[PDB]
mmCIF file of C-alpha atoms and ligand atoms in Angstrom:
data_model
loop_
_atom_site.group_PDB
_atom_site.id
_atom_site.type_symbol
_atom_site.label_atom_id
_atom_site.label_comp_id
_atom_site.label_asym_id
_atom_site.label_seq_id
_atom_site.Cartn_x
_atom_site.Cartn_y
_atom_site.Cartn_z
ATOM 1 C CA UNK A 1 173.840 236.713 73.074
ATOM 2 C CA UNK A 2 176.987 235.650 74.959
ATOM 3 C CA UNK A 3 180.453 237.245 74.878
ATOM 4 C CA UNK A 4 181.107 238.305 71.290
ATOM 5 C CA UNK A 5 183.885 237.166 68.994
ATOM 6 C CA UNK A 6 187.087 238.979 70.033
ATOM 7 C CA UNK A 7 189.570 240.194 67.402
ATOM 8 C CA UNK A 8 192.913 241.787 68.308
ATOM 9 C CA UNK A 9 194.960 243.730 65.741
ATOM 10 C CA UNK A 10 198.552 244.924 65.975
ATOM 11 C CA UNK A 11 197.861 248.621 65.236
ATOM 12 C CA UNK A 12 195.003 251.084 64.841
ATOM 13 C CA UNK A 13 194.497 251.256 61.041
ATOM 14 C CA UNK A 14 193.678 247.538 60.874
ATOM 15 C CA UNK A 15 191.517 247.864 63.987
ATOM 16 C CA UNK A 16 189.264 250.437 62.329
ATOM 17 C CA UNK A 17 188.970 248.579 59.012
ATOM 18 C CA UNK A 18 188.215 245.316 60.848
ATOM 19 C CA UNK A 19 185.700 246.980 63.155
ATOM 20 C CA UNK A 20 183.750 248.260 60.127
ATOM 21 C CA UNK A 21 183.555 244.727 58.751
ATOM 22 C CA UNK A 22 182.657 243.314 62.172
ATOM 23 C CA UNK A 23 179.956 245.887 62.854
ATOM 24 C CA UNK A 24 178.165 244.955 66.058
ATOM 25 C CA UNK A 25 178.836 241.179 66.069
ATOM 26 C CA UNK A 26 182.514 241.304 67.099
ATOM 27 C CA UNK A 27 184.751 243.478 69.275
ATOM 28 C CA UNK A 28 188.028 244.599 67.620
ATOM 29 C CA UNK A 29 190.876 246.080 69.691
ATOM 30 C CA UNK A 30 194.363 247.315 68.783
ATOM 31 C CA UNK A 31 197.559 246.383 70.622
ATOM 32 C CA UNK A 32 199.261 249.731 69.964
ATOM 33 C CA UNK A 33 197.447 252.795 71.166
ATOM 34 C CA UNK A 34 196.784 255.904 69.044
ATOM 35 C CA UNK A 35 199.962 257.930 68.563
ATOM 36 C CA UNK A 36 202.367 255.107 69.464
ATOM 37 C CA UNK A 37 205.249 254.298 67.128
ATOM 38 C CA UNK A 38 204.364 250.944 65.546
ATOM 39 C CA UNK A 39 207.507 249.662 63.785
ATOM 40 C CA UNK A 40 209.686 249.156 66.886
ATOM 41 C CA UNK A 41 206.915 248.987 69.508
ATOM 42 C CA UNK A 42 207.816 247.162 72.752
ATOM 43 C CA UNK A 43 204.845 245.053 73.941
ATOM 44 C CA UNK A 44 203.748 245.119 77.578
ATOM 45 C CA UNK A 45 202.092 242.636 79.971
ATOM 46 C CA UNK A 46 198.729 244.218 79.062
ATOM 47 C CA UNK A 47 199.350 243.414 75.405
ATOM 48 C CA UNK A 48 200.025 239.715 76.038
ATOM 49 C CA UNK A 49 196.836 239.310 78.070
ATOM 50 C CA UNK A 50 194.828 241.093 75.364
ATOM 51 C CA UNK A 51 196.187 238.945 72.521
ATOM 52 C CA UNK A 52 195.898 235.762 74.589
ATOM 53 C CA UNK A 53 192.181 236.486 75.230
ATOM 54 C CA UNK A 54 191.450 236.935 71.508
ATOM 55 C CA UNK A 55 189.824 234.491 69.132
ATOM 56 C CA UNK A 56 191.770 235.888 66.165
ATOM 57 C CA UNK A 57 194.846 238.132 65.824
ATOM 58 C CA UNK A 58 195.280 240.267 62.678
ATOM 59 C CA UNK A 59 198.588 241.801 61.580
ATOM 60 C CA UNK A 60 200.032 243.606 58.563
ATOM 61 C CA UNK A 61 203.028 241.472 57.772
ATOM 62 C CA UNK A 62 205.399 242.906 55.158
ATOM 63 C CA UNK A 63 207.936 243.178 58.048
ATOM 64 C CA UNK A 64 205.952 246.108 59.520
ATOM 65 C CA UNK A 65 205.701 244.869 63.099
ATOM 66 C CA UNK A 66 209.293 244.015 63.875
ATOM 67 C CA UNK A 67 208.109 242.989 67.354
ATOM 68 C CA UNK A 68 205.334 240.613 66.306
ATOM 69 C CA UNK A 69 207.326 237.413 65.852
ATOM 70 C CA UNK A 70 208.757 237.472 69.384
ATOM 71 C CA UNK A 71 205.427 238.659 70.810
ATOM 72 C CA UNK A 72 203.474 235.901 69.100
ATOM 73 C CA UNK A 73 205.582 233.138 70.684
ATOM 74 C CA UNK A 74 204.151 234.182 74.026
ATOM 75 C CA UNK A 75 200.582 233.564 72.728
ATOM 76 C CA UNK A 76 199.201 230.003 72.886
ATOM 77 C CA UNK A 77 196.362 228.592 70.748
ATOM 78 C CA UNK A 78 195.197 231.869 69.152
ATOM 79 C CA UNK A 79 195.166 231.876 65.329
ATOM 80 C CA UNK A 80 196.726 234.763 63.434
ATOM 81 C CA UNK A 81 196.151 236.039 59.907
ATOM 82 C CA UNK A 82 198.146 238.536 57.846
ATOM 83 C CA UNK A 83 195.895 241.055 56.120
ATOM 84 C CA UNK A 84 198.143 241.825 53.115
ATOM 85 C CA UNK A 85 197.886 238.677 50.977
ATOM 86 C CA UNK A 86 197.641 239.774 47.341
ATOM 87 C CA UNK A 87 199.272 243.176 47.930
ATOM 88 C CA UNK A 88 201.942 243.990 45.337
ATOM 89 C CA UNK A 89 204.890 245.251 47.413
ATOM 90 C CA UNK A 90 206.998 248.293 46.663
ATOM 91 C CA UNK A 91 210.615 247.894 47.862
ATOM 92 C CA UNK A 92 212.601 250.012 50.253
ATOM 93 C CA UNK A 93 215.409 251.279 48.049
ATOM 94 C CA UNK A 94 217.938 252.841 50.446
ATOM 95 C CA UNK A 95 219.368 252.435 53.886
ATOM 96 C CA UNK A 96 219.668 249.498 56.266
ATOM 97 C CA UNK A 97 216.289 248.085 55.184
ATOM 98 C CA UNK A 98 216.983 248.198 51.423
ATOM 99 C CA UNK A 99 215.274 245.257 49.762
ATOM 100 C CA UNK A 100 212.695 244.801 52.521
ATOM 101 C CA UNK A 101 209.132 245.600 51.428
ATOM 102 C CA UNK A 102 207.685 249.019 52.166
ATOM 103 C CA UNK A 103 204.913 247.943 54.579
ATOM 104 C CA UNK A 104 202.634 251.018 54.368
ATOM 105 C CA UNK A 105 200.365 249.439 51.751
ATOM 106 C CA UNK A 106 197.132 250.752 53.370
ATOM 107 C CA UNK A 107 197.799 254.336 52.200
ATOM 108 C CA UNK A 108 196.350 253.419 48.801
ATOM 109 C CA UNK A 109 192.537 253.245 48.991
ATOM 110 C CA UNK A 110 192.611 250.620 46.229
ATOM 111 C CA UNK A 111 194.872 248.545 48.510
ATOM 112 C CA UNK A 112 192.352 249.007 51.335
ATOM 113 C CA UNK A 113 189.974 246.961 49.184
ATOM 114 C CA UNK A 114 192.468 244.087 49.459
ATOM 115 C CA UNK A 115 192.834 244.568 53.225
ATOM 116 C CA UNK A 116 189.039 244.397 53.448
ATOM 117 C CA UNK A 117 188.844 241.153 51.466
ATOM 118 C CA UNK A 118 191.536 239.476 53.571
ATOM 119 C CA UNK A 119 189.967 240.568 56.859
ATOM 120 C CA UNK A 120 186.513 239.480 55.647
ATOM 121 C CA UNK A 121 187.911 236.069 54.670
ATOM 122 C CA UNK A 122 189.522 235.539 58.089
ATOM 123 C CA UNK A 123 186.445 236.620 60.064
ATOM 124 C CA UNK A 124 184.202 234.395 57.961
ATOM 125 C CA UNK A 125 186.448 231.379 58.504
ATOM 126 C CA UNK A 126 186.961 231.859 62.232
ATOM 127 C CA UNK A 127 183.455 233.101 63.150
ATOM 128 C CA UNK A 128 181.206 231.381 60.593
ATOM 129 C CA UNK A 129 178.082 232.014 62.706
ATOM 130 C CA UNK A 130 178.228 235.645 61.541
ATOM 131 C CA UNK A 131 179.457 235.068 57.961
ATOM 132 C CA UNK A 132 176.393 236.827 56.476
ATOM 133 C CA UNK A 133 177.002 239.953 58.554
ATOM 134 C CA UNK A 134 180.724 240.147 57.781
ATOM 135 C CA UNK A 135 180.030 239.733 54.072
ATOM 136 C CA UNK A 136 177.314 242.415 54.042
ATOM 137 C CA UNK A 137 179.429 244.849 56.083
ATOM 138 C CA UNK A 138 182.556 244.217 53.996
ATOM 139 C CA UNK A 139 180.615 244.978 50.809
ATOM 140 C CA UNK A 140 179.111 248.166 52.245
ATOM 141 C CA UNK A 141 182.476 249.390 53.548
ATOM 142 C CA UNK A 142 184.271 248.621 50.269
ATOM 143 C CA UNK A 143 181.626 250.790 48.566
ATOM 144 C CA UNK A 144 182.540 253.704 50.834
ATOM 145 C CA UNK A 145 186.244 253.183 50.101
ATOM 146 C CA UNK A 146 185.705 253.072 46.320
ATOM 147 C CA UNK A 147 183.823 256.366 46.553
ATOM 148 C CA UNK A 148 186.948 258.143 47.834
ATOM 149 C CA UNK A 149 188.991 257.849 44.627
ATOM 150 C CA UNK A 150 187.363 260.523 42.483
ATOM 151 C CA UNK A 151 187.168 263.234 45.203
ATOM 152 C CA UNK A 152 190.763 262.507 46.283
ATOM 153 C CA UNK A 153 191.948 263.032 42.693
ATOM 154 C CA UNK A 154 189.885 266.233 42.528
ATOM 155 C CA UNK A 155 191.535 267.644 45.667
ATOM 156 C CA UNK A 156 194.990 267.149 44.139
ATOM 157 C CA UNK A 157 193.940 268.089 40.601
ATOM 158 C CA UNK A 158 195.386 271.596 40.633
ATOM 159 C CA UNK A 159 199.022 270.535 41.061
ATOM 160 C CA UNK A 160 200.547 269.997 37.591
ATOM 161 C CA UNK A 161 202.427 266.759 37.033
ATOM 162 C CA UNK A 162 205.935 268.155 37.314
ATOM 163 C CA UNK A 163 205.160 269.870 40.650
ATOM 164 C CA UNK A 164 203.710 266.743 42.329
ATOM 165 C CA UNK A 165 206.539 266.196 44.834
ATOM 166 C CA UNK A 166 205.634 264.685 48.224
ATOM 167 C CA UNK A 167 208.397 265.396 50.774
ATOM 168 C CA UNK A 168 207.807 263.696 54.121
ATOM 169 C CA UNK A 169 209.822 262.452 57.066
ATOM 170 C CA UNK A 170 209.297 258.698 56.854
ATOM 171 C CA UNK A 171 209.035 257.333 53.322
ATOM 172 C CA UNK A 172 205.636 255.989 54.352
ATOM 173 C CA UNK A 173 203.599 257.410 51.443
ATOM 174 C CA UNK A 174 204.953 255.457 48.451
ATOM 175 C CA UNK A 175 201.724 253.549 47.774
ATOM 176 C CA UNK A 176 199.599 256.704 47.968
ATOM 177 C CA UNK A 177 202.092 258.615 45.798
ATOM 178 C CA UNK A 178 202.085 255.965 43.069
ATOM 179 C CA UNK A 179 198.277 255.917 42.918
ATOM 180 C CA UNK A 180 198.052 259.711 42.558
ATOM 181 C CA UNK A 181 201.117 260.424 40.419
ATOM 182 C CA UNK A 182 203.410 262.027 43.009
ATOM 183 C CA UNK A 183 207.187 261.791 43.225
ATOM 184 C CA UNK A 184 208.335 260.985 46.764
ATOM 185 C CA UNK A 185 211.260 262.427 48.757
ATOM 186 C CA UNK A 186 211.858 261.325 52.360
ATOM 187 C CA UNK A 187 214.161 261.997 55.300
ATOM 188 C CA UNK A 188 214.457 258.286 56.150
ATOM 189 C CA UNK A 189 213.148 255.321 54.119
ATOM 190 C CA UNK A 190 211.426 253.604 57.059
ATOM 191 C CA UNK A 191 211.207 254.217 60.818
ATOM 192 C CA UNK A 192 214.153 252.666 62.700
ATOM 193 C CA UNK A 193 217.185 253.463 64.797
ATOM 194 C CA UNK A 194 219.573 254.237 61.966
ATOM 195 C CA UNK A 195 222.526 256.147 60.574
ATOM 196 C CA UNK A 196 222.501 258.597 57.676
ATOM 197 C CA UNK A 197 219.626 260.995 58.495
ATOM 198 C CA UNK A 198 221.738 264.207 58.797
ATOM 199 C CA UNK A 199 223.225 263.522 55.356
ATOM 200 C CA UNK A 200 219.778 262.781 53.927
ATOM 201 C CA UNK A 201 218.474 266.072 55.345
ATOM 202 C CA UNK A 202 221.263 267.846 53.441
ATOM 203 C CA UNK A 203 220.344 265.794 50.348
ATOM 204 C CA UNK A 204 216.631 266.677 50.589
ATOM 205 C CA UNK A 205 217.425 270.356 51.106
ATOM 206 C CA UNK A 206 219.224 270.194 47.741
ATOM 207 C CA UNK A 207 216.291 268.508 45.955
ATOM 208 C CA UNK A 208 213.804 271.053 47.304
ATOM 209 C CA UNK A 209 215.978 273.976 46.236
ATOM 210 C CA UNK A 210 216.576 272.576 42.744
ATOM 211 C CA UNK A 211 212.871 271.912 42.094
ATOM 212 C CA UNK A 212 211.349 274.818 44.108
ATOM 213 C CA UNK A 213 209.199 272.386 46.087
ATOM 214 C CA UNK A 214 206.940 274.556 48.300
ATOM 215 C CA UNK A 215 206.137 272.290 51.274
ATOM 216 C CA UNK A 216 207.499 269.491 53.492
ATOM 217 C CA UNK A 217 205.647 267.331 56.044
ATOM 218 C CA UNK A 218 206.118 265.224 59.175
ATOM 219 C CA UNK A 219 203.990 262.360 60.543
ATOM 220 C CA UNK A 220 202.004 261.877 63.743
ATOM 221 C CA UNK A 221 204.171 259.215 65.482
ATOM 222 C CA UNK A 222 207.638 260.688 64.843
ATOM 223 C CA UNK A 223 209.468 263.942 65.535
ATOM 224 C CA UNK A 224 208.819 267.059 63.448
ATOM 225 C CA UNK A 225 212.282 268.535 64.069
ATOM 226 C CA UNK A 226 214.030 267.216 60.897
ATOM 227 C CA UNK A 227 211.171 268.410 58.683
ATOM 228 C CA UNK A 228 211.245 271.811 60.388
ATOM 229 C CA UNK A 229 215.010 271.942 59.845
ATOM 230 C CA UNK A 230 214.438 271.383 56.117
ATOM 231 C CA UNK A 231 211.797 274.146 56.047
ATOM 232 C CA UNK A 232 214.147 276.591 57.785
ATOM 233 C CA UNK A 233 217.035 276.002 55.403
ATOM 234 C CA UNK A 234 215.041 275.845 52.160
ATOM 235 C CA UNK A 235 212.264 278.385 52.626
ATOM 236 C CA UNK A 236 209.645 275.699 51.981
ATOM 237 C CA UNK A 237 206.608 275.822 54.255
ATOM 238 C CA UNK A 238 206.292 273.255 56.989
ATOM 239 C CA UNK A 239 203.026 271.711 55.867
ATOM 240 C CA UNK A 240 202.112 270.094 59.169
ATOM 241 C CA UNK A 241 201.470 266.570 60.366
ATOM 242 C CA UNK A 242 200.292 263.738 58.117
ATOM 243 C CA UNK A 243 198.721 260.544 59.467
ATOM 244 C CA UNK A 244 199.969 257.176 58.213
ATOM 245 C CA UNK A 245 201.062 254.860 61.035
ATOM 246 C CA UNK A 246 198.260 255.674 63.509
ATOM 247 C CA UNK A 247 194.772 257.018 63.862
ATOM 248 C CA UNK A 248 194.133 259.585 66.534
ATOM 249 C CA UNK A 249 191.959 258.775 69.511
ATOM 250 C CA UNK A 250 188.227 258.608 68.948
ATOM 251 C CA UNK A 251 187.746 262.256 70.017
ATOM 252 C CA UNK A 252 190.692 263.562 67.982
ATOM 253 C CA UNK A 253 191.122 264.760 64.400
ATOM 254 C CA UNK A 254 191.669 261.373 62.669
ATOM 255 C CA UNK A 255 189.378 258.839 64.377
ATOM 256 C CA UNK A 256 188.900 256.473 61.404
ATOM 257 C CA UNK A 257 190.744 254.980 58.426
ATOM 258 C CA UNK A 258 188.605 257.066 56.051
ATOM 259 C CA UNK A 259 189.407 260.234 58.003
ATOM 260 C CA UNK A 260 193.095 259.331 57.755
ATOM 261 C CA UNK A 261 193.042 259.138 53.962
ATOM 262 C CA UNK A 262 190.945 262.306 53.631
ATOM 263 C CA UNK A 263 192.964 264.402 56.058
ATOM 264 C CA UNK A 264 196.342 263.327 54.719
ATOM 265 C CA UNK A 265 195.296 264.179 51.158
ATOM 266 C CA UNK A 266 193.688 267.454 52.234
ATOM 267 C CA UNK A 267 196.810 268.497 54.156
ATOM 268 C CA UNK A 268 199.009 267.702 51.148
ATOM 269 C CA UNK A 269 196.749 269.686 48.826
ATOM 270 C CA UNK A 270 196.624 272.689 51.193
ATOM 271 C CA UNK A 271 200.435 272.719 51.163
ATOM 272 C CA UNK A 272 200.468 273.463 47.435
ATOM 273 C CA UNK A 273 197.615 275.980 47.419
ATOM 274 C CA UNK A 274 198.225 279.722 47.148
ATOM 275 C CA UNK A 275 195.559 280.758 49.697
ATOM 276 C CA UNK A 276 197.774 282.351 52.356
ATOM 277 C CA UNK A 277 198.386 286.073 53.055
ATOM 278 C CA UNK A 278 197.507 288.240 50.031
ATOM 279 C CA UNK A 279 198.282 291.824 49.057
ATOM 280 C CA UNK A 280 197.134 293.881 46.081
ATOM 281 C CA UNK A 281 200.270 293.765 43.900
HETATM 282 FE FE1 FE B 1 205.438 253.853 59.069
HETATM 283 MN MN1 MN B 2 186.721 253.457 66.726
#
């Protein structure tokens, strides 16, 4: 046993999925650290050395990592593989990135099955000595992912169809919302330096009032102030922080991809539940 196969990923969600497929035969590390904003990340000297020492670099594609193309020119002789081949993209419909794909495809557990297949394929090609282990681990992990669907639908099952409105800060939840029959409302379509957010906050305030939507959310890598501003003006609850663009650290609340799907869905469902402060009417 010499130095293992080294895989570097752009961000933490892919790192955790890949590390489950790799098991103990490869080391998988993320360029961005937990909590860091991933769309407009600015790579550092540490990041170049890490990628340059890898045997394989994995990235999302779908224009997620706006920094990756420039970064990857500084890497010599390290193969890269996008993990989203075969994903059916949803478009960004408004704002300066209209017509660019929504990149957050991993928020659908059924899409995670496609991520798994693509990562498995790349590991098997680039580290064939461990092909049997990658295949066995990919199959076992896909089984765990498939087992999420029914309990996730159960958690959300008490919100009738017309009330299934998911109001978040970044429009990062479109793939999850489509799989579970939610209508999405966002404060900005995709993370970026951009115009138009104050007007969209006013727009979203109007939608929440019209439809009596009870809860709004923020996400773990961006500011909660606009969501709190919506809560103040509408009387909707601030439902707390959802996880989409990053895991937490290994000793935090969202250490794994599976914990990210579970906690995000549980936090959404808690926002619609009536189990707060009760009196005897
Ligand atoms: Fe995002
Ligand atoms: Mn880990």
